[PDB]
């Protein structure tokens, strides 16, 4: 597969056709890389495996020699990068002692993955450095990575710090401690100590909550940098304290203890970024102190906190913001003091159009404001920010809107007075009437506001729903779906207040849009109908179901991901609840239409589908519909079938399977194999759902499992084995064990194979058989296999014997046989032979 015009430089050796005459042939055959980089997806797959199994063969040297240039390529893609990352992982699951010379030679390319805009790139990078460090040795990593500490560029120092974070997560803090503790005391130059401290931080972020045990030692390291003559070291130091305390869940306060007294002092004398950093640290600290000591100390911090609102620094504003959250979100702080001193400057400087356009500042601002509401109360905050709902820009409106949302979510709408409530509803409608983008914030916002107001909202309905219909035209593509969803979430409120005319409106009006050709709208429409069904009942539906349901029936062709979803859902609600209003003929047509809905690429679609199919199975009764399931061609191998199997299960539940089984068991006869294993699955899920009731049917299924478990082809043994499992859990304790032993006979030979699905299947099988039969019989099959020095039987029988061993280890005692004692050892336990 083709070569980009640049990649020639790398792959030129492949171009020449000289062939068939040692190492040069290994580099030459190693161009399978090219097949991984560019080509068809299958070529990438097969190539990837082929190079995985050749790891031990080719060795890490030639590979990395032929890779690292590519992953270093200036023209590298996104995908190609990620794929080469994959091959590096998969080969590094194998090679262990081999990589030692290349470790640095790896990290140099990989460390740039840690600092990246892409998140998935970062989690990948952390993963592969974890695999590398754990793969190599500790001393390998340490002795490797020293010279990058004092490197002139700070880039490598930084990304190297995150590297030490990852490797420290791998091999644990205490192993790597003396290295660090040695580093931060290095007397050569400051840059080192700066690095090592940054390492402390990135360890704090990465490990997070798990820092807890070594917190003391870590602090004892870092403390000496706060007083250092250099500035950076001080700044990054206190920052690292911050990260610690933030991962320091409400405890280890005294471990930070000796750190405080300098910090507070510094709080006085500092100008610039370092100051803000200290404020960050102290900020995360205060929640960890005692409300008495933290009373004083807090009251001291509040002053500077006030004074420093006004700085243009955005780092500043972030810090002091989150600070205000923690300091003023303290239970030991008085409302009125905040109400006077803080709120007016807070809404003055902080609420502006510089903030909201940014992302982090947006969020953090939301949170802090939410908490201030949590203390001073509701009507204050909201009352001050309502007037901004009507502000021009979107993002700002979005901000105050979600703020109001969370506020009225927590505190409740009860505190709100009347006039401010008028400004509320008008604000929310007005903001909702202009929507540049589609998003939930405005909608969830409105819904939460109304559901919180309760029936105080009643005078406002006609304005609401007037807007709802007029908007319900305007633009279908953009706003139809949105006004529809608005109805959906406002259903219950439009119900409990007992406005019936409005339910007539929404009922037939929405009924009319079911002919809408745009799917993304229609979906929202059906959703709205759904929500309306859950408030007003069956027989009171203003569009009587006789009208509605057959009008729904043809829509199932619609392909669309949202239409199919909501549609099938609603057919489910009505098919489950009333179900009498519609004649059976319509129903069976619904069936023959439902059958091909199982091509859905989405799992929830199939979910609702099968459950519905059960409901209508109740509405009619088993035989016909289970026959219509058995009609299935099985045509698709990758699933698309076994959902029908699930329908066979649930159908067998909805009316007693005590009826249904003979039809199925007969339908195993058919020579077509894939449907044979199909009905095997049907038995599996069947027993999984029936549980206890299998105390009878075990016998019926027993000989057929004999026929199936006796192998035509592996899938028979597998699926049948799964059946044995779920049967074995289900029947437990009821006294049927005998036939389960018989079936265990035929289960037992299948123990040996390398196919993952059949071996894990058999494992589940013998586990369920363990609990059902009891360990004694198991162990009596597992004894002789232990001994076997043959590199197979011992592997397996010891795997089994372990599975039997972990559970029920208490009950095994009696069943260990008598084993005679040799020369040096006494192998007879004589306690059991004490006789009265």
């Amino acid at each position: 597969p083709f070569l980009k015009p640049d990649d020639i430089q790398y792959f030129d050796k492949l171009l020449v056709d000289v062939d068939e005459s040692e190492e040069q042939k290994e580099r030459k055959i190693m161009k399978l890389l090219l097949k991984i980089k560019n080509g068809t997806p299958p070529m990438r797959k097969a190539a990837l495996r082929q190079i995985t199994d050749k790891a031990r063969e080719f060795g890490a040297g030639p590979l990395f020699n032929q890779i690292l240039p590519l992953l270093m390529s200036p023209t590298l893609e996104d995908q190609e990068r990620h794929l080469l990352v994959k091959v590096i992982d998969r080969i590094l699951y194998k090679l262990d002692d081999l990589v030692r010379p290349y470790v640095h030679k790896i990290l140099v390319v990989i460390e740039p993955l840690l600092i990246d805009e892409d998140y998935y790139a970062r989690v990948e990078g952390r993963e592969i450095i974890s695999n590398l460090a754990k793969a190599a040795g500790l001393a390998t990593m340490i002795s490797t990575m020293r010279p990058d500490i004092d490197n002139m560029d700070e880039y490598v120092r930084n990304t190297t710090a995150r590297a030490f974070a990852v490797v420290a997560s791998a091999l644990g803090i205490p192993s790597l401690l003396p290295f660090l503790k040695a580093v931060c005391k290095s007397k050569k130059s400051w840059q080192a100590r700066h690095t090592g401290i940054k390492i402390v931080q990135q360890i704090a972020i990465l490990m997070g909550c798990a820092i807890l045990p070594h917190l003391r030692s870590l602090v004892e390291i870092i403390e000496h940098g706060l007083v250092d003559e250099q500035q950076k070291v001080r700044t990054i130091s206190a920052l690292a304290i911050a990260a610690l305390a933030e991962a320091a869940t409400p405890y280890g306060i005294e471990s930070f203890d000796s750190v405080l007294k300098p910090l507070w002092k510094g709080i006085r004398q500092h100008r610039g970024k370092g100051l803000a950093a200290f404020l960050k640290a102290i900020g995360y600290l205060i929640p960890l102190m005692d409300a008495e000591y933290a009373n004083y100390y807090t009251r001291e911090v509040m002053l500077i906190l006030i004074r420093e609102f006004q700085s243009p620094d955005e780092e500043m504003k972030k810090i002091v913001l989150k600070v205000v959250k923690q300091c003023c979100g303290t239970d030991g702080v008085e409302a009125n003091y905040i109400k006077t001193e803080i709120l007016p400057p807070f809404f003055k400087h902080f609420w502006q159009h510089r903030m909201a356009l940014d992302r982090r500042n947006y969020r953090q601002l939301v949170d802090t404001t939410v908490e201030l509401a949590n203390k001073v109360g509701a009507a204050e905050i909201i009352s001050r920010i309502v007037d901004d709902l009507k502000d021009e820009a979107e993002q700002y409106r979005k901000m105050v809107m979600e703020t109001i949302e969370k506020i009225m979510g927590n505190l409740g709408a009860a505190d709100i007075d009347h006039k401010l409530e008028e400004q509320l509803i008008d604000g929310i409608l007005y903001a909702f009437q202009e929507q540049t983008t589609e998003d939930s914030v405005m909608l969830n916002g409105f819904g939460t506001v109304v559901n919180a107001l309760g029936k105080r909202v009643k005078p406002y309905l006609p304005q609401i729903c007037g807007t709802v219909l007029w908007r319900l035209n305007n633009k279908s593509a953009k706003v139809r779906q949105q006004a529809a969803d608005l109805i959906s979430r406002t259903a219950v409120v439009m119900k409990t207040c007992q406005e019936e005319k409005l339910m007539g409106h929404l009922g037939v009006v929405l009924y009319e849009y079911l002919g809408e050709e745009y799917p993304e709208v229609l979906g929202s429409i059906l959703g709205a109908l759904k929500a309306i069904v859950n408030v007003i009942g069956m027989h009171k539906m203003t569009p009587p179901i006789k009208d509605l349901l057959p009008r729904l029936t043809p829509i199932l062709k619609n392909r669309h991901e949202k239409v199919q979803e909501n549609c099938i859902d609603l057919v489910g609600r009505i098919a489950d609840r009333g179900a009498e209003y519609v004649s059976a003929r319509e129903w069976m047509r619904i069936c023959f239409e439902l059958l091909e809905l199982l091509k859905a690429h989405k799992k929830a679609i199939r979910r609702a589908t099968v459950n519905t199919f059960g409901y209508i199975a109740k509405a009619i009764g088993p035989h016909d519909v289970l026959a219509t399931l058995l009609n299935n061609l099985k045509v698709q191998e990758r699933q698309n079938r076994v959902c029908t199997t699930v329908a066979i299960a649930i159908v067998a539940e909805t009316c007693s399977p005590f009826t249904v089984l003979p039809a199925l068991m007969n339908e195993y006869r058919v020579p077509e194999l894939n449907v044979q294993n199909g009905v095997l699955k049907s038995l599996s899920f069947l027993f999984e759902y029936i549980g206890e009731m299998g105390k009878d049917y075990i016998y019926a299924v027993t000989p057929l499992l004999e026929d199936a478990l006796m192998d035509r082809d592996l899938v028979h043994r597998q699926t049948a084995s799964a059946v044995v499992q779920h049967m074995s859990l289900g029947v437990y304790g009821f006294g049927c064990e005998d036939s389960l032993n018989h079936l265990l006979n035929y289960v037992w030979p299948n123990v040996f194979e390398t196919s993952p699905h059949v071996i894990q299947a058999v494992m589940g099988a013998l586990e369920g058989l363990r609990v059902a039969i009891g360990p004694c019989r198991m162990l009596q099959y597992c004894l002789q296999g232990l001994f076997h020095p043959a590199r197979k039987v011992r592997d397996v029988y010891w795997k089994i014997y372990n599975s039997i061993y972990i559970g029920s280890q208490d009950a095994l005692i009696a069943h260990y046989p008598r084993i005679y004692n040799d020369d040096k050892n006494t192998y007879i336990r004589y306690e059991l032979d004490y006789i009265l």
Partner: protein, 183 residues
Amino acid sequence: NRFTVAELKQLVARPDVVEMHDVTAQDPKLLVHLKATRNSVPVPRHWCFKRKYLQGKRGIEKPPFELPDFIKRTGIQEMREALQEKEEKIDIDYQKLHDAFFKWQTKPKLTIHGDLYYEGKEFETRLKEKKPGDLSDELRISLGMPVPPPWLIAMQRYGPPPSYPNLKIPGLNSPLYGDVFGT
């Protein structure tokens, strides 16, 4: 460091269960004691095989499965076959299926606790040891004798069989009802 098979068989009290792979274990005495237990089961025969106990039935195309009499006496199989022929409904009864599931319930042929599944387990339909004096019905039909089987007339002349010396067959030294003409 490892004892031979003859020394392990002479030391064991039950040498009819020792195998060739048990000498390569770490403790042959405990393995020989555990293999000679009362209600113990042996390991599967796929410990040394390389077919993974499921690849030997490649060309075998026998009946996929067989329904029981309690399902065949309900008429659901013929209705399902008619529905499959129409596609390529019935509503026969609702209490007859409950009667076939409860009253007309047939207990299936189970197996013993030591009856493990073999590799083939279909061509070795062994059954006790139908010996001298005891035969099956049909072969009576081929023989066609109304209720001795007539070559125990020649077991008069030529003598009692060398193969089963303990023999008695009716009317000769064994002084018989139904099928079984000798013990």
